Design a protein around this ligand. Structure first.
Ligand SMILES: NCc1ccc(-c2cn[nH]c2-c2c[nH]c(C(=O)NCc3ccc4c(c3)CCO4)c2)cc1C(F)(F)F
Length: 341
C-alpha cells in the first residue's frame, strides 16, 4: 500500500516508483512493469457525491470507446475486486511532460508551434464531434503535450452527447464549464448542447497561444459576456434576430454600441491566416461559427491538412436522474474489462 503526499495510492504490483503531479482525487506518475514505460495514474474517490460519479462514468465510457492520437486514452483501470471493497478507482493514462497552460505561462510560442498545436486540437476535436460528442471544457490545462510537442485532449468529465434540438434556455442560465472559454450564447440562450460550443473554446485557446494571455478573462458570469463584446463589438441586427428570448435580446439592446477591435490590433505579430481562422471560430452567432472540418481545411493549416489522415469515430456515441449507489455499480461494471480475472 504505497503512500503519496499523505494519501493511500495502492496501484498494485504492476505500477511502481510513484511521483506526485497534481489534484475528486490525486494524479501520480509511475513505472509500468508490463509495458516498461512510465505512465500517469489518476486516483479518483467519487462515490460520496453523484456529480463526481456522473463525471467519472461519462469520461470512462467515452475514453474507453475513443481511440485517437490526439485524445488521452485509458490504458488500464485499477480498483478493488468487489463493489464493497471499491473505495477508489485508479485510471492509468498516457504520461505527458507538460500541458499548454504550463507552457503558455513561461514560453513564447513560435507561429510553427501555434500552427501545429491548433492542427492537433482540431484533429482530435474532429474525431470527438464525429462521435456526436461535445468536450465542453476545452482550455489550455486540458491539452497535454510531450517533449516533441505531440498534443492530447484530456478531461471528458463535462462531455455530453450533442443535443442541438434541446439547446435553448433562458437568460443567465447557470453553467459549469470554465468561464473564460464559454461561448457568448451560454450567458444568453444556450445549454452548450451544440458542437459550436467547443469551436468557441478552441478560438479562445488560439487567441491565448498568440499572446500568452486569456483573450476574455471574465471575473464573473456576466463579466464574461462583457469581455467577449468588448472585442467582437455589438451583435448585428441579424445576430440579435436569431436570439428570440426577450430577456437575452433586451439585455444586449440595453448596452451602448461597441465597435469590433480588429484582430491584427490585438495580435500585431500573428500570422494573417491564423487571425482569419480566429475570426471564424470567435464568431458571435453560433450558427455562422466555423465547424471543425472547415477549420481543418482553412489555409492556415494547409501544411498539415490531410482529411484521409484525420480519422473519425467508427460509430456515434441517462445519467442526470441516477443515484451515486447505482452509478458506483456502473463504474464497477465499466471497469470490469481491466481486472486480472
Ligand atoms: N498538474 C496538472 C496536471 C498536469 C498534467 C497531468 C497529466 C500528465 N500526464 N497525464 C496527465 C493526466 C492524466 N489524466 C488527466 C486528467 O484526467 N485530468 C483531468 C482531471 C479530471 C478530474 C479529476 C482530476 C483530473 C484529478 C481528480 O479529479 C491528466 C495531470 C494533471 C492533474 F493533476 F491535474 F491531473
Amino acid at each position: 500500500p504505497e503512500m503519496v503526499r499523505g494519501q493511500v495510492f495502492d496501484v498494485g504490483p504492476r505500477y511502481t516508483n510513484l511521483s506526485y503531479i497534481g489534484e475528486y482525487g490525486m494524479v501520480c506518475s509511475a513505472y509500468d512493469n508490463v509495458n516498461k514505460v512510465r505512465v500517469a495514474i489518476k486516483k479518483i474517490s467519487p462515490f460520496e457525491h453523484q456529480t463526481y460519479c456522473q463525471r467519472t462514468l461519462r469520461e470512462i465510457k467515452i475514453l474507453l470507446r475513443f481511440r485517437h492520437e490526439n485524445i488521452i486514452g485509458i490504458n488500464d483501470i485499477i480498483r478493488a475486486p468487489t463493489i464493497e471493497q471499491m473505495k477508489d478507482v485508479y485510471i492509468v493514462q498516457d504520461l505527458m511532460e507538460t500541458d499548454l497552460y504550463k507552457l503558455l505561462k513561461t514560453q513564447h510560442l513560435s507561429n510553427d508551434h501555434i500552427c501545429y498545436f491548433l492542427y492537433q486540437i482540431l484533429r482530435g476535436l474532429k474525431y470527438i464531434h464525429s462521435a456526436n460528442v461535445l468536450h465542453r471544457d476545452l482550455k489550455p490545462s486540458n491539452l497535454l503535450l510531450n517533449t516533441t510537442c505531440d498534443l492530447k485532449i484530456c478531461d471528458f468529465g463535462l462531455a455530453r452527447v450533442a443535443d442541438p434540438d434541446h439547446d435553448h434556455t433562458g437568460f443567465l442560465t447557470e453553467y459549469v464549464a470554465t468561464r473564460w472559454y464559454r461561448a457568448p450564447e451560454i450567458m444568453l440562450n444556450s445549454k452548450g448542447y451544440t458542437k459550436s460550443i467547443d469551436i468557441w473554446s478552441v478560438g479562445c485557446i488560439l487567441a491565448e497561444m498568440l499572446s500568452n494571455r486569456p483573450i476574455f478573462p471574465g471575473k464573473h458570469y456576466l463579466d464574461q459576456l462583457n469581455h467577449i463584446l468588448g472585442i467582437l463589438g455589438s451583435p448585428s441586427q441579424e445576430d440579435l434576430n436569431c436570439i428570440i428570448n426577450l430577456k437575452a435580446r433586451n439585455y444586449l439592446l440595453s448596452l451602448p454600441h461597441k465597435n469590433k477591435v480588429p484582430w491584427n490590433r490585438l495580435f500585431p505579430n500573428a500570422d494573417s491566416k491564423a487571425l482569419d481562422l480566429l475570426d471564424k471560430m470567435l464568431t458571435f452567432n453560433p450558427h455562422k461559427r466555423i465547424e471543425v472540418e472547415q477549420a481543418l481545411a482553412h489555409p492556415y493549416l494547409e501544411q498539415y491538412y490531410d482529411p484521409s489522415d484525420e480519422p473519425i469515430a467508427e460509430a456515434p456515441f441517462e445519467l442526470d436522474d441516477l443515484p451515486k449507489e447505482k452509478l458506483k455499480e456502473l463504474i464497477f461494471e465499466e471497469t470490469a474489462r481491466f481486472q486480472p480475472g
